[PDB]
């Protein structure tokens with residue numbers, strides 16, 4: 001998932017925004 | 022904004038900055 005992707009690959013702030021409440 | 026390579030606690034710092042007041046869920050794989 002996001003956690004893993006940001007660490008093994010890369011991720012954007014826009015992807016991270018999906019985990020906001 | 023630039024793309025991110027974020028592991029461990031560095032990810033939840035990023036989540037904190039992105040989301041601010043909104044809060045967030047930190048949901049790693051088991």
Ligand SMILES: [Co+2]
Pocket residue numbers: 031
């Ligand atoms: Co470190």
